Each structure stands twice: as C-alpha cells, then as structure tokens.
Design a protein around this motif. Structure first.
Motif, PDB file in Angstrom:
ATOM      1  N   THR A  89       7.421   1.557  -0.318  1.00 42.97           N
ATOM      2  CA  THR A  89       8.193   3.623   0.230  1.00 42.97           C
ATOM      3  C   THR A  89       8.618   3.099   2.058  1.00 42.97           C
ATOM      4  N   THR A 109       3.691   1.756  -4.634  1.00 43.85           N
ATOM      5  CA  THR A 109       3.169   1.596  -3.046  1.00 43.85           C
ATOM      6  C   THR A 109       4.632   0.282  -2.108  1.00 43.85           C
ATOM      7  N   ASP A 154       8.434  -0.287   4.219  1.00 41.98           N
ATOM      8  CA  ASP A 154       8.160  -1.822   3.483  1.00 41.98           C
ATOM      9  C   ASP A 154       8.981  -2.488   4.264  1.00 41.98           C
ATOM     10  N   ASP A 178       4.257  -1.865   5.199  1.00 40.26           N
ATOM     11  CA  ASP A 178       4.175  -2.891   5.464  1.00 40.26           C
ATOM     12  C   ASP A 178       4.417  -3.522   5.855  1.00 40.26           C
ATOM     13  N   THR A 238       0.796  -1.687  -0.122  1.00 40.21           N
ATOM     14  CA  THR A 238       0.181  -0.022   0.301  1.00 40.21           C
ATOM     15  C   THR A 238       0.870   1.729   0.012  1.00 40.21           C
ATOM     16  N   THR A 239       0.552   2.060   0.099  1.00 41.55           N
ATOM     17  CA  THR A 239       0.962   3.878   0.005  1.00 41.55           C
ATOM     18  C   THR A 239       1.731   4.111   1.015  1.00 41.55           C
ATOM     19  N   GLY A 240       1.289   2.471   2.078  1.00 42.75           N
ATOM     20  CA  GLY A 240       1.656   3.377   3.583  1.00 42.75           C
ATOM     21  C   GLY A 240       3.183   2.248   3.708  1.00 42.75           C
TER      22      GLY A 240
HETATM   23 CA   LIG Z   1       4.324   0.364   1.378  1.00 43.57          CA
END
Ligand SMILES: [Ca+2]
Ligand SMILES: [Ca+2]
Ligand SMILES: [Ca+2]
Ligand SMILES: [Ca+2]
Ligand SMILES: [Ca+2]
Ligand SMILES: [Ca+2]
Lengths: 163, 163
Positions: free
Chosen positions: B34, B32, B37, B11, B7-9
């Motif tokens: 980022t 994604t 991660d 992970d 995700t764009t967070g």
């Molecule tokens: Ca991510």
C-alpha cells in the motif's frame, strides 16, 4: 533510534532523543496526519515521512511538528503546503509529486527540495526557504516559478527536463 | 533470517542482512502492499512474497523496494507490473496468474518467470529482463508474446500447453 506510527486519530508522539523516524502514512487509504496531531523529536537524527494517496492540501488544524529535522512529503496528487508556522526546528523540507502541481512555501532556515516527475501541464511554484532546489522531469507546458512571493535565504538551484 | 509482515498501513521494514523474507498478503481481503510502504533488505537471501485476490495493477504511490533479490507476485486476477524502476537490487521476478492476463516488463539484470495456469483466451505479454521464462498451461486462444517492446538480455524460454 525508534520508529513511530501516526493513526487516523489525534496523536501525541515523542521521540527518543535519537535516530528516530515518524511515519505519517495511510491506514485504509485514510490519511494519518490529521487534526491536533502533535509530534516531538529530541536528538538530531529525526525524520517525518508523510505519504498520502490524496492531495496535500495544507497542514491540518492544530498540527504542530517540533524537533524534527527532515520532512518528506509525497502525494498521489498535488501538494500545497506552507511550513513557515507550526513547524519549528526543521532544517530540510522535501516535497514529491508525480504528475500533478506543487505550491510550496518554506520558512527561512529550511532547505526546500521540490522533486516532480512527469510534470506535464502542471505548474510548480515555490517560495521562501533557505537553499531551494527544484528538480522537475517530463516537463512540457508547466511553468517553474521560484520566489515570486518570497525569496530564498540561500541558493536557488532549479533543474528542468523535457522529452 | 527473520520474517516480516506487511499491514494495510504504511510499513517501514528493514531486514537482518541475512536470509530474510517479506510477506505482502491480504488482511480482510485488503491488500498489504500500500501507499508509502518502504522495504529494505541487507544481505543476499532476500525474498518478497506479494499475494492478492485482487488484480496487480502497478506499484503503489511512494512504495520503494530495495535490497531485495527475489520478488514473487501472485494474483487471483490479472498482473500488470513494470519493474525497471522503484525496485532496485532485484535479480529475480516471478509472476503467477491462474485464469487471467499477464503484462509484465522487467529491468535487465532481472530474471523474469511468468507462470500462468488455465490461460484460456487471456494474453500473456512480457518484455525486458535478463533470462525470461514463460510457463503457460491450459492455453486455448491466448497469445503468448515476448520482447515485442524490449528484448531479453539473456535467454528466452517459452513453453505452452493446450488441452
Ligand atoms: Ca502496507
Ligand atoms: Ca530523537
Ligand atoms: Ca493522526
Ligand atoms: Ca531532533
Ligand atoms: Ca537481509
Ligand atoms: Ca539483500
């Protein structure tokens, strides 16, 4: 255990009393450890992973970490934090830079480990903690300096590499 | 195996120890893979598919890929990555451009394959790796250049088409 994610808001997170891990990453390149965040662990396999592009600057207002044994702090820029307050139950603090300064102070009872890659002209300074470890590579001009303001309870173990 | 989406967070993804595949696409045209991660494989049928409109630039801060055997990297623009660190356990790296440069370095033990369509005046440059393969079509001005900085462990196999 279970895996819990911080948001760009105010989080009130409580672990399972088990092998649980707390993620304080980024959202759109926005920090997720933020004002008022309160985290709570339970049983003794608890990890907090704090990862940010932005420099770590201090613990943010109203933040309290509790019942979490290991804290990992990684920044795309400098780290400056103090963990002698707000944080309770923390046996191990690990702080990680690549190519910027570090200025860390741990509470006694907490084993500090300051790993720094490509230190260059940046200065590491650490204080307090139980056992401290400095692990610095690519060093150059950078001073390394331990216990200038507060000594360790346990052992110091610096190591420094220069190319 | 099981199929896991980035995700764009930040992970924290962990495989089954089986045929599992990791997807690192886009969300609103936002990458994604980022900061922070962390990906983990298990047994040996592990794939990471990294696909981005934006140029691949470098591995982002705090990212660690581990236990993953095949990495596929596809970009709407240039690729620049080095995989002699951050990534561990990697047997195969495949990088894919269409109409922009490539500048890739693999760790020995990793089989590099740099496929490039419509190369035009863009330059491919690759280094290191075990077996390397360059597959370039629509070529024109573009230099192709292998092992200028670090040779391959195994075989080089360039091929280049021009219209
Ligand atoms: Ca991510
Ligand atoms: Ca717990
Ligand atoms: Ca938060
Ligand atoms: Ca705990
Ligand atoms: Ca697996
Ligand atoms: Ca694997």
């Amino acid at each position: 255990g279970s895996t819990l994610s911080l948001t760009t808001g105010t989080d009130t997170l409580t672990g399972t009393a088990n092998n649980d891990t707390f993620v304080a990453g980024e959202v759109a390149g926005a920090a997720t450890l933020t004002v008022g965040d309160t985290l709570s662990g339970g049983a003794g396999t608890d990890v907090l992973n704090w990862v940010q592009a932005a420099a770590v600057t201090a613990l943010p207002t109203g933040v309290t970490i509790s019942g979490i044994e290991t804290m990992n702090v990684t920044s795309g820029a400098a780290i400056t934090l103090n963990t002698s307050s707000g944080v309770t139950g923390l046996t191990a603090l690990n702080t990680n830079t690549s190519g910027a300064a570090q200025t860390v102070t741990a509470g006694a009872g907490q084993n500090l480990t300051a790993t720094t890659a490509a230190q260059a002209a940046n200065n590491v300074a650490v204080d307090g903690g139980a056992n401290v470890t400095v692990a610095s590579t690519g060093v150059t001009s950078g001073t390394t300096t331990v216990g200038a303001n507060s000594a360790a309870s346990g052992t110091v173990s610096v190591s420094v590499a220069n190319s």
